[PDB]
Subunit: 261 residues, 3 copies
């Protein structure tokens, strides 16, 4: 019996695109094809006016075991006609990081190796208490790809990054949180309810605010002055500020209107 093929699927409802990493026979490991699919899918979701928020999640009760080891060179060192190589896992990471819309990773079960790199490409990660996280290049003889390694260092600092990468240890979700690898941890019995509420919240906020701030955060410590001037000047011209002020003063929830162009 041959395994069911690994794939990245998407389901869209109420402005939320649920992107699922589905390769359960390999604990949701990423194949080269899966990386290519993410790479193609993220710009389509960014252009789709029916999508306001992206949610990234593993099929079943596990997030992602990393690049598939049985095809590791094709994922990280894939030869190209011009004589370079391509790291498809990093290109997938970048496609997710370039989304202008909010993206959240919901991590349950195991998030291993390049799984964290994909998860961390989202804006932030919410983990189930029972999840485990390990970055294991050192268990395999490879190097964590540059964008992942730099992002780690910036999120958790130099010392924690070394603890994480040199030992390749597996951490519980509350440990991962203490280290800075994830933004929040939710008990298992309420994980589903809390993630659904979180998503509803992101669907209620001003999209002008979220788009602007996501972009301005991403530029911080990466010119940047021109982007700030443009966003600050767009702010009163967007309809969301007036709607937000007046909702607040009337003690009601705002019905925001700005949409990406």
């Amino acid at each position: 019996a041959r395994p069911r093929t690994g794939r990245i699927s998407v389901a869209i409802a109420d402005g939320v695109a649920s992107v699922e990493i589905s390769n359960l026979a390999q604990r949701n490991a990423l194949t080269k094809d899966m990386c290519l699919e993410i790479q193609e899918l993220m710009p389509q979701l960014d252009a789709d006016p029916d999508v306001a928020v992206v949610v990234l999640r593993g099929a079943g009760d596990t997030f992602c075991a990393g690049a598939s080891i049985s095809e590791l060179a094709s994922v990280l060192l894939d030869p190209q006609p011009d004589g370079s190589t391509a790291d498809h896992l990093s290109r997938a990471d970048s496609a997710i990081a370039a989304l202008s819309k909010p993206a959240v990773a919901l991590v349950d079960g195991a998030c291993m190796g390049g799984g964290w790199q994909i998860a961390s490409a989202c804006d932030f990660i919410i983990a189930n208490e029972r999840a485990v996280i390990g970055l294991t290049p050192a268990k395999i003889g490879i190097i964590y790809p540059r964008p992942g390694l730099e992002r780690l260092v910036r999120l958790v600092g130099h010392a924690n990054a070394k603890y994480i990468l040199l030992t390749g240890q597996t951490f519980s979700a509350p440990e991962a949180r203490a280290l800075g690898l994830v933004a929040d941890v939710v008990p298992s019995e309420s994980f589903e309810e809390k993630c659904a509420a979180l998503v509803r919240s992101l669907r209620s906020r001003s999209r002008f605010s979220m788009h602007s701030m996501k972009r301005l955060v991403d530029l911080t410590d990466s010119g940047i002055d021109q982007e700030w001037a443009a966003a600050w000047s767009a702010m009163p011209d967007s309809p969301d500020m007036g709607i937000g002020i007046s909702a607040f003063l009337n003690r009601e929830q705002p019905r925001f209107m700005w949409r990406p162009a």
Copy 2:
């Protein structure tokens, strides 16, 4: 009627954000008062330490929403606009003296920006913190956004700003938004002892390190290090500290600014 008040005793300037009807929201006038007050405190030889807190049991609800444009987008005769909340922030962050924010109750919107302009924040366990520009359709001002990103990292900053969620003080601490959390029953006593501690440390050490920390990651910095390192043994505090330690007693330090 909203106002900034100050009381000075034993080298401690207690600055209070007082606008209780609006849960200590900042008006434009209040921002202008902070802006004027900080440099006076810095020049006052009777002030060693500044403590910032809210009137009653609540810290600051942010820029007053009913006058939001006046606080953040105040038009100026040359055609620019002013952000008075950021100017206030910057007046607090330019203090050369140690400044601590004591946060109880709610610290919302720009409240965190004012609090975080101090050197660090100590929160009561029952306090709540939310940064809510995304609930209003605005953008967090640049100094505050950047400071946030540098204190909590990119991912936590987005979690905080994109959701605009309200966090308990322990959660805020886990995220990096405040430096420590004290249970409610012992908050006042512990804050008072913290303040007594700052008042008994070497002021040469505090002044120097606050400044060197603030310069870290902003030739210019080399000269400041060389000047401070060279001033260190010429200040009296080092000899007083060494000898107090060896005699097993608490040092009575003497260096004073300016």
Copy 3:
């Protein structure tokens, strides 16, 4: 009765160099001679092919009480023939931080003043739950040396660094961890077992991976493009990647082979 002289010793077994700060009469405070010994030793350890990992630990049940206060000027302000002064504690710190091999500080008991500086020059710190950490220059009227101050600022952020330095408070290990001063905390009853397992882990990982990543982490936000290109290109030429892939696919532990040249 004269005190037993403070010293830095090393013991080497199974590729681990255990470096011990031994000056128990002063709670393992560092004298000038001890700082000079660290400074001379670290490069020897880096060049010794029998050493793969360095572990830094205090004699007995305490780590380090900082520069010895009774000889503070000779450690921090040591006069030199050209009229300048030398900070031996910082030079010891730099010698440790220049190690290309993995280095871990195991902190028990007290780690005070410049003790944190020496510990934080290692890649990361594992603390016993009963350990205490305080950075106390402000209790003494001095300034934390620049490499330490900057490292602190980068590891814990500006606000936590000012809380730590301006108060000079002593923190418990779990507090120090919450602030970012140490990477992990282990209960006292299992500290020895868990440190030994940690060290065995580091001795099991790919040394190609550890060397490369340590160096790339240390370069992040410090030329860097060329280093990345060289390491990435070396990766498939090193034998460790092929050994790591096969071991994983055969469900066994890898026996890695790369060694530094």
